[PDB]
């Protein structure tokens, strides 16, 4: 109970780490779908050129 | 440390200011700064560009080119002789002291990985220091030392997910 | 009465939807343009000096007769401000005389004294001419010619580093030798800096270029190209199959003394090799590439020792001295140090006994060290895919089948 | 083996047609890497049948149990490691990939329609997995190793 | 999206658990929330028992794997470049070139 | 096929075997770097022919 903060702080760094990754996933997940919607949109522009 | 940002300024003033030929102290620093960042090819062709006018008048510039000879020749004791010779204060004397230090740790990081065993006298001259200071300098490091034969024995010396996700989405299309 | 009229015709076309009639004013000129155009260039800098300055400057440097009297400082400071921050925009659509502006400015400065300022000016001349990913214009060829002769290879490297696709023509404005010049000079540029890899690749692209006749650059690039591969490697680098037919038929046996060099090289005999260089000392020194031929003399000594790694793992200095032919344990210990210091071989020395130990071991691919290089080397292949994908979409819009 | 490496249920449900009557037109059929040793056998009899639209269901108890189960099953997700588990699929697919290129290389030369377009898709397919594997690995290195004492 | 969905809401469970323990840790020392020796004890272990492998050997092996996977990506990317190249080559060597 | 090095100090012959790992890595870098080098070349080669670049004779 002297160093109960020495136990608490080590726990916080892991709680921080949990957020570090959680948000880190959601960025990379939303970007991997965005790069798929980047190409799917850009490949519709390549095909519509042929209509001329 | 800051010699990098300052060398940039010298090289610019070569083509910037003059109709062709830069200032005589600007030539004195460009030659010595190339030696500081071990660029002997740049130091060689710089010397051959100087007009014979500034060459003859500015005789201290010859004292800096005499250093470059020894770096090309790799006569390491000759380097430290030629560094301790010409006092060109304000302009060059600050970069001459930094030159001797870069050549020293080059020859230490070299000798350490190039020799399992080596003569103390050679080792002394190759780094520049005398016999005692060399024998001491290494004993601090924890290098093995040998009496009688005089043989120093050198000891040999999101971020990640963002990168990955790209290589997926790239190959994925 | 006529020369003071069409100074207004340039300004009237300027700031309009079309300046395609200005493409006929700069081409006409009137041939015999009087001394009077010096005046007309002062009451001019309105929007940004227009393409008027280009029509004027083209005639000045193509006098080939008294540049502008010995006031060529007036003639340079004239071109100095035009090339700097005036630039314009439609320089792209008039490279007819703009390519020629940089050619004549060069040709003069070469034979004059030295272009050390002349290099600095020619840099910005490229930048609003080429648009995006660098485009191989004739100015690149000259920029090298200046900074080759003016012993200052530093500033041209920014452009030599990028392997620019797409040849900038525009009103023709490109010559069948200004391709050879860039990659010939460039090759030599890196040769002095001792970037032999890039040096070889440059000379290579010179030899490829198609040619119904034997041009004179192609013979020299080949001779030095021979020396580069014999220092970089220990052998002859073969060319592409698409090299010009005039090369293997004529140019190759014309540079015979350099193949004759490789003849002895593969035998690994420096003493014999040296006796060949002394015979054709003339032929080699005639081409001002002696020294580079002597760099091969040293690379053979370094090849000789490079082989030992594959056979022996512990060898004496004396043994090495006797086997490498250098004689004396110092000369042996010498190149050991240098090769190590440089990083051509993995070895070390035990002076106490007087032995050379061959580490023979670099890296185990077990750390970020590779991981980073793996990341970087890969990104350069993806960079390469990006280009090809754009280059594939370039073909999309053009005619049918 | 691929259910694992691909990281999701690799499954199929099919029904064959009569020997006499032959199928209608409407048929996209999605591409999967077929090893060349087998590509022939598939290729012949592949058009003789038709697949079935798969769907997955569950009971109330099953659904309620799996939710109560997940209290302690998240641990297995972050000590998963699909690498030494199915090591002998990915190491094998290379052998398959190498052959598919070998063909299309000589196809360009002298001499089934552009077998580099397949091989390109296979090189991605197999490597896409290999990369996805190292995603869950670094995810773990981030988590459990980097706390300090 | 179809891969990291697993980790996303799985680690959500990890964060849910790890945080709610630390909520008890702060409130126990703060007081009023019942102080307990035989629960807080296991927490002292739990948190220092972390540094889950920082052994010189382990990480070498971890990087050993990464480099292997990396090699596979380098070769895989060359393949895609090689196809995208030949996609461009044929379209150039027919429209531009006369076979 | 004598895959073995020479220790001429103590005059011994040791067998020298291959680091499998090193091998496949090593060459993959180098091959890829070769592929990159030719890609540079055939990009310029696409350009020179596109511009009809050649030195004529007569």
Swiss-Prot record, chain A:
Recorded coiled-coil stretches: 22-52
Post-translational modification: Phosphorylated by CK2 and PKD kinases.
UniProt tissue specificity: Widely expressed. Expressed at high level in brain, heart and skeletal muscle.
Compartment(s): Cytoplasm; Nucleus
Protein family according to the UniProt entry: Belongs to the CSN7/EIF3M family. CSN7 subfamily.
Function: Component of the COP9 signalosome complex (CSN), a complex involved in various cellular and developmental processes. The CSN complex is an essential regulator of the ubiquitin (Ubl) conjugation pathway by mediating the deneddylation of the cullin subunits of SCF-type E3 ligase complexes, leading to decrease the Ubl ligase activity of SCF-type complexes such as SCF, CSA or DDB2. The complex is also involved in phosphorylation of p53/TP53, JUN, I-kappa-B-alpha/NFKBIA, ITPK1 and IRF8/ICSBP, possibly via its association with CK2 and PKD kinases.
Subunit text: Component of the CSN complex, composed of COPS1/GPS1, COPS2, COPS3, COPS4, COPS5, COPS6, COPS7 (COPS7A or COPS7B), COPS8 and COPS9 isoform 1. In the complex, it probably interacts directly with COPS1, COPS2, COPS4, COPS5, COPS6 and COPS8. Interacts with PMF1. Interacts with the translation initiation factor EIF3S6. Interacts with CK2 and PKD. Interacts directly with ID3. (Microbial infection) Interacts with vaccinia virus protein C9L.
Protein name, entry field: COP9 signalosome complex subunit 7a
UniProt organism field: Homo sapiens
Gene that encodes the chain: COPS7A
Swiss-Prot record, chain B:
Localization (cell): Cytoplasm; Nucleus
GO BP field: activation of NF-kappaB-inducing kinase activity; COP9 signalosome assembly; negative regulation of cell population proliferation; protein deneddylation; protein neddylation; protein phosphorylation; regulation of protein neddylation
UniProt keyword Cytoplasm, yes or no: yes
Domain of life: Eukaryota
PCI domain: residues covered: 1-157
Keywords: Cytoplasm, Nucleus, Phosphoprotein, Signalosome
Gene3D superfamilies: 1.25.40.990
InterPro entries found in the cross-reference section: COP9_CSN8, CSN8_PSD8_EIF3K, PCI_dom
Main location class: cytoplasm
One of the record's GO cellular component terms: cytoplasm
UniProt subunit comment: Component of the CSN complex, composed of COPS1/GPS1, COPS2, COPS3, COPS4, COPS5, COPS6, COPS7 (COPS7A or COPS7B), COPS8 and COPS9 isoform 1. In the complex, it probably interacts directly with COPS3, COPS4 and COPS7 (COPS7A or COPS7B).
Function: Component of the COP9 signalosome complex (CSN), a complex involved in various cellular and developmental processes. The CSN complex is an essential regulator of the ubiquitin (Ubl) conjugation pathway by mediating the deneddylation of the cullin subunits of SCF-type E3 ligase complexes, leading to decrease the Ubl ligase activity of SCF-type complexes such as SCF, CSA or DDB2. The complex is also involved in phosphorylation of p53/TP53, c-jun/JUN, IkappaBalpha/NFKBIA, ITPK1 and IRF8/ICSBP, possibly via its association with CK2 and PKD kinases.
Family according to the record: Belongs to the CSN8 family.
Protein name: COP9 signalosome complex subunit 8
Organism: Homo sapiens (Human)
UniProtKB/Swiss-Prot annotation, chain C:
SS bond partners: none
Domain PCI: 195-363
Location(s), subcellular: Cytoplasm; Nucleus
Principal localisation: cytoplasm
Acetylation in keyword set: yes
Keywords linked to the UniProt accession: Acetylation, Cytoplasm, Nucleus, Phosphoprotein, Signalosome
Keyword Iron-sulfur on entry: no
One GO term (biological process): protein deneddylation
GO cellular component, one term: cytosol
Transmembrane feature ranges: none
Tissue and organ distribution: Widely expressed. Expressed at high level in heart and skeletal muscle.
Leftover remarks: Amplified and overexpressed in some osteosarcomas (OS), suggesting that it may participate in TP53 degradation in OS.
Family: Belongs to the CSN3 family.
Role according to the record: Component of the COP9 signalosome complex (CSN), a complex involved in various cellular and developmental processes. The CSN complex is an essential regulator of the ubiquitin (Ubl) conjugation pathway by mediating the deneddylation of the cullin subunits of SCF-type E3 ligase complexes, leading to decrease the Ubl ligase activity of SCF-type complexes such as SCF, CSA or DDB2. The complex is also involved in phosphorylation of p53/TP53, c-jun/JUN, IkappaBalpha/NFKBIA, ITPK1 and IRF8/ICSBP, possibly via its association with CK2 and PKD kinases.
Protein name in the entry: COP9 signalosome complex subunit 3
Organism annotation: Homo sapiens
UniProtKB/Swiss-Prot annotation, chain E:
Domain of life: Eukaryota
Subcellular location: Nucleus; Cytoplasm; Cytoplasm, Perinuclear region
Segments of this protein annotated with the region Interaction with Vpr: 1-99
Tissues where the protein occurs: Widely expressed.
Family: Belongs to the peptidase M67A family. CSN6 subfamily.
Subunit structure: Component of the CSN complex, composed of COPS1/GPS1, COPS2, COPS3, COPS4, COPS5, COPS6, COPS7 (COPS7A or COPS7B), COPS8 and COPS9 isoform 1. In the complex, it probably interacts directly with COPS2, COPS4, COPS5, COPS7 (COPS7A or COPS7B) and COPS9 isoform 1. Interacts with the translation initiation factor EIF3S6. Interacts weakly with RBX1. Directly interacts with COP1 and 14-3-3 protein sigma/SFN. Interacts with ERCC6.
Purpose: Component of the COP9 signalosome complex (CSN), a complex involved in various cellular and developmental processes. The CSN complex is an essential regulator of the ubiquitin (Ubl) conjugation pathway by mediating the deneddylation of the cullin subunits of SCF-type E3 ligase complexes, leading to decrease the Ubl ligase activity of SCF-type complexes such as SCF, CSA or DDB2. The complex is also involved in phosphorylation of p53/TP53, c-jun/JUN, IkappaBalpha/NFKBIA, ITPK1 and IRF8, possibly via its association with CK2 and PKD kinases.
Protein name, per record: COP9 signalosome complex subunit 6
Upper taxonomic lineage: Eukaryota, Metazoa, Chordata, Craniata, Vertebrata
Chain's gene name: COPS6
Shown part of the complete sequence: 218 to 316 of 327
